[PDB]
Amino acid sequence: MSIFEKDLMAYFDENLNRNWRGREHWKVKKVLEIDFFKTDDSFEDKVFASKGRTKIDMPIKNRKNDTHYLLPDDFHFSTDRITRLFIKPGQKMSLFS
Amino acid sequence: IDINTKIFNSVAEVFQKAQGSYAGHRKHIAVLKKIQSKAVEQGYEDAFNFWFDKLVTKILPLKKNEIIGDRIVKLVAAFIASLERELILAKKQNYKLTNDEEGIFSRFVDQFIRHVLRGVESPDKNVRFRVLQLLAVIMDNIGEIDESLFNLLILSLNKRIYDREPTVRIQAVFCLTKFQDEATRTLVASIQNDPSAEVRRAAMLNLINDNNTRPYILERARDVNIVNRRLVYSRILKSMGRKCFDDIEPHIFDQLIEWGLEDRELSVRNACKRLIAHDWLNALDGDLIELLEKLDVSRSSVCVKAIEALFQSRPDILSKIKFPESIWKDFTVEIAFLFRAIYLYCLDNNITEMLEENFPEASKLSEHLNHYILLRYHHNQSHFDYNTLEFIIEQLSIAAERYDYSDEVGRRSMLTVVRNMLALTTLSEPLIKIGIRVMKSLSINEKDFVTMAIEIINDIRDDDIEKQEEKEASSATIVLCLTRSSYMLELVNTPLTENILIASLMDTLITPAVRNTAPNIRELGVKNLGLCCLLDVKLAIDNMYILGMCVSKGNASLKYIALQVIVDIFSVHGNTVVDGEGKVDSISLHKIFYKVLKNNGLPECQVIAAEGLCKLFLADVFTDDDLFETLVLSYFSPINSSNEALVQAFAFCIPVYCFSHPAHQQRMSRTAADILLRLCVLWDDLQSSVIPEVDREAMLKPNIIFQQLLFWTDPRNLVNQTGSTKKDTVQLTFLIDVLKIYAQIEKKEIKKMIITNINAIFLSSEQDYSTLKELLEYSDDIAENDNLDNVSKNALDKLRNNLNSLIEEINER
DNA sequence: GATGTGTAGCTACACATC
DNA sequence: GATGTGTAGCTACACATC
């Protein structure tokens, strides 16, 4: 048998490969020029202005992360691991039937 | 004209034209050195340094990637470098250029850096970027510097590493990488704690990669960014070449290759496959055997995956493999594995030519297979030898399982090898498993396979009883018989009545095994018991209750195996084993599922309880909502957010269940309303409470959860589109159920979270008429009899409007 | 063989803007 | 938060040159 079951088996795996964490990780000209001769140089001081109100720094919350941005351990939950029985991997049940 | 003004015109001319193209960069470099040389002879050295700086200040405010900046930056870098170069080749032998050009450079580079460091903390993001950009490119060519300026650079950089913008943080490490031989410490911190993947990458590739830093670099093999996981294999492991087998430890090494070969992304796998096949093979001179000594085969598990990809990459070397004739005297774990790998490969893809002459005959392999059994078990680094022999025996046996046995002499020969192998009382489990697998392949029919196995089982049983002739085999013997029986029963696939010997065996020890006092023996007894229950239905019913008590009072190991049995009994027999005369009531079993699922102390047991329940609900053997509701709660609940195995299981099972059949989705919609409520209370309770350990962020926010339930219930995601499933109202009825619940929540923010995401709905003209009317009557009721939040008011007003227009559409005959 | 150069297409992740 | 345009890496193939 398994015309319908192999049909759907194939669909889900390919479609749900980026949803495996499944935890809030489920997607679903001008050629302007500069005239170096002109003396608009009082803008030079605009480049060196102090920060003042602008934060231009990272909040300390984000400067350290415990996850380290590593993937979680992958148990590779695929349609195959679900179809096969527990104590009898050879045999499988006909869910999607 | 003044000399100072002349200098300005000359340098300004260069920059004005250099900005246009890379065409005359060489000339410009030569011009500048000429302008500089003429300025220092006239005493105006400082005049050159002054103007030059002002013009590099003109380009800083330009954005990143602004075409003009790059050109000027490249020029300034080439100018510094060209000056340094003039200064090195002299020092190599010729000295001392009597025009003080070493001091002029040290005086110029020191003065230049201090100028661009006046915009290191500017508010403008572009100024900060290009200041760091100038430093990275000129960093290598600074030569020597005063000590103070050295402290001022590391001081400014160790602050800019934590800058707001990721871009400037990338340029920061580029400037720090040139200091590695304290800088290392900072980069190790940024490769781990930086949110921008491109900063982690930059810190990864340009890191020192000595003995101490290497682990953090190889850590990125599991970086959440796909690119950062691909380049570690491509860039870093190609840069090391053979240094991997020498400097990297095997236990870390075996893990890397493992992650790469089975990563979820197609891109990362190719980066690892190609690395092994193309680069390492060429790096190892084509020695397929030596490559298998690197990828340890005795203690690894993915060599099967690596050898396949290799054969796919190099089908030419495939034909030149020779298993030289009858020289199997020296058969290394690499060769023995090679044998299994190549043989099973040709069978899978029907490499017809090889299967004829490149492999020994059935009977001729039995000579070599047995040759290692006597050498291992019969007659007397000893354990190294023991393990290697079992390994070889294992590889040949796995290949022997799938041999052509049209030849009868070969079949009967091998058969006599496994039968005298399985009869061994010191056979390790890996060999017991495959031995049965081979003997299953030899048997002509099932009854045969059973009889032979049973005989070996009883002989080992009786050999100990008659030796004591208290009539019960030693606890050890009981283990060996039971493990042998399970592997057999795993292969038997017909009722017990047709095989009388199974029942006799089961009556002897499978039952006393259950009643034993040893854990391991008990677990095995349940294992075999379950395998028999899948064959006889009445046997399952008679044993439904007994299993339920081991899942309630049994230790973790027994509780673990016992539950699996119950799940499979249901998979094959359905509800025939419960709810009936002499059959256990399903309510008791649902209560046992509850207990296991709830129990926080044993995670793995939660997993099989979760994984099992989904399989049953999938086959429609389970259809209880109050249980299905408790099933979804355990997914988001903060108490189960710490079990990694448990989350992924539900990630895969819940979508497939909802999208498999309309009825399964309908069930989600009917109950998903109450679900969101219970979680909203849990989030609120979790947020408000103050208890030394909290991690209130250990759970999803109700807005995300709401979108989640709208996704699953979305009728657009049904795999089988009947064409008339677009009039399904499942999501509407869900939302209607939530609106009636909207009055039970009490916190503004939560209510906003629900309302803000209500417009992910799917509304169509073919959908029923009265259901939209109902949803509209509830929506407007909430909109105009409650104080809303401007955000929530517009989004809600919008939803209302979607209907109204819709009602005209349908209202027209 | 091994290597460039040439165009084209692609996906995740940046930024920009409002 | 939600956006549109960007952009970083490829990937792939046709080649032309050495």
Residue numbers in the entry:
A (entry chain B): 383 to 410, 456 to 524
B (entry chain A): 7 to 187, 205 to 403, 410 to 498, 567 to 910
What does the paper say about this structure?
Even in the co-crystal structures of Sc Ycg1–Brn1 with DNA, 43 residues of the linker that connects the α1 and α2 segments of Brn1 remained disordered. The trajectories of the visible residues that flank the linker, however, indicate that the path of the connecting peptide leads over the bound DNA helix. Since the length of this linker is considerably shorter in most other species, we shortened the linker of Sc Brn1 by 27 residues to match the linker length of the human NCAPH kleisin subunit and co-crystallized the new construct with DNA. The structure of this construct very closely resembles the previous Sc Ycg1–Brn1–DNA structures. Although the shortened linker also remained disordered in this structure, the only conceivable way to span the distance of ∼36 Å between the two visible ends with the short linker is by running the connecting peptide over the DNA helix. As a consequence, the Brn1 kleisin subunit encircles the DNA double helix within the loop that is formed by the association of its N-terminal latch and C-terminal buckle segments. Furthermore, addition of BMOE created a crosslink of the Brn1 loop and resulted in the formation of an SDS-resistant complex with circular DNA substrates even in the context of the Ct Ycs4–Ycg1–Brn1 ternary complex. These experiments provide proof that the DNA bound within the Ycg1–Brn1 groove must be enclosed by the Brn1 loop.
